[PDB]
Design a protein around this ligand. Structure first.
Ligand SMILES: NCc1ccc(C(F)(F)F)cc1
Ligand SMILES: NCc1ccc(C(F)(F)F)cc1
Length: 330
């Protein structure tokens, strides 16, 4: 079997992408944030503290004839940005673009952090990292991808994120019409539960390519590109007037500047991020200081190839017994 679903940016800056997901019988359609950096499928629900819901579409298990409460199971998650949520667990039927999984763990939020409440466009998250990171206790649960793997034509999914435009998540097949040239595959380490890989280096604009190993994770659930301080300093040094601002919390630049592209290596291949992808607009309404899309990972502890990098490529998440990541230009 296969599945295909359109994913849409939630705002004018591509801060996140939402994809419609059908849950329950009859279907309840929720717009979920597909997150290859986490492994919980959790949703706003009829059980969520009422004051913590502000416009989200909620999952109502009591209206689904296929929902079963997973007795005694709870979940609690904290994301690298400080957001968090927790609740109890149902199993139900979950469908993504024609691909159906029965008995999927659907984690019902009882409590969500403020950043989720204020995001009226995101009804929940669909985790696509490895199931070892799932937070359900006392019995760990599998991700949607792990549950679907056996019935998929090929144990893969692909991310084709758009720049200020819709894109596509495909499950079980590779669309050879969606990219140019060849796909370059690179080894993945699952030892931390992430889609973790090693980039072979970088270039700033038309500068010389620097061969150097950068270990990081492919994370559709993170907006920006977080790289080591040496690399990030080399990039912003090429933008007149750019500086790291402690009050803002990262590199800012004059909104009148033109940004250079950023190239990152995948084996012997190169993915080029156009400079416009790195502009995240004014730091406050009406400001002439703009926020940069490439930031330092020094405070994080791991390098993150977030949406800024991934949307410049066609990305294959190969969940074979030896997992790999594939990157192609598009
Ligand atoms: N998108 C999920 C996510 C968020 C943060 C991290 C961090 F910070 F731990 F790297 C990993 C994965
Ligand atoms: N990386 C996972 C993640 C995704 C979105 C959010 C937000 F935007 F809702 F806060 C937090 C954490």
């Amino acid at each position: 079997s296969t599945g295909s679903a359109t994913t849409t940016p939630i705002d004018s800056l591509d801060d996140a992408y939402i994809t419609p997901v059908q849950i329950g019988t009859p279907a309840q359609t929720l717009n979920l944030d597909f997150d290859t950096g986490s492994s919980d499928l959790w949703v706003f629900s009829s059980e969520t503290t009422a004051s913590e819901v502000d416009g989200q579409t909620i999952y109502t298990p009591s209206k689904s004839t296929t929902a079963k409460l997973l007795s005694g199971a709870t979940w609690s998650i904290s994301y690298g940005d400080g957001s968090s949520s927790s609740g109890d667990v149902y199993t139900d039927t979950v469908s993504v673009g024609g691909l159906t999984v029965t008995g999927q763990a659907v984690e019902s939020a009882k409590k969500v952090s403020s950043s989720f409440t204020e995001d009226s466009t995101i009804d929940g998250l669909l985790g696509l990292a490895f199931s070892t990171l799932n937070t359900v206790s006392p019995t760990q649960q599998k991700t949607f991808f792990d549950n679907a793997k056996a019935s998929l034509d090929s144990p893969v999914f692909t991310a084709d994120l758009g720049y200020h435009a819709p894109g596509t998540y495909n499950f079980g097949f590779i669309d050879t019409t969606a990219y140019t040239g060849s796909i370059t595959y690179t080894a993945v380490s699952t030892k931390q539960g992430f889609w973790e890989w090693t980039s072979t280096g970088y270039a700033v604009g038309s500068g010389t390519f620097k061969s150097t190993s950068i270990d990081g994770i492919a994370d559709t659930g993170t907006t920006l590109l977080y790289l080591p301080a040496t690399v990030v300093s080399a990039y912003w040094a090429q933008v007149s007037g750019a500086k790291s601002s402690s009050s803002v919390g990262g590199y800012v630049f004059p909104c009148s500047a033109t940004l250079p592209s950023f190239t990152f290596g995948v084996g012997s291949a190169r993915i080029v991020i156009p400079g416009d992808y790195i502009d995240f607009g004014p730091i406050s309404t009406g400001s002439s200081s703009c926020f940069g899309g490439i930031q330092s990972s020094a405070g994080i502890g791991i390098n993150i190839f977030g949406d800024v990098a991934l949307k410049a490529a066609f990305v294959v998440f190969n969940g074979a017994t030896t997992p790999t990541l594939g990157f192609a230009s598009k």
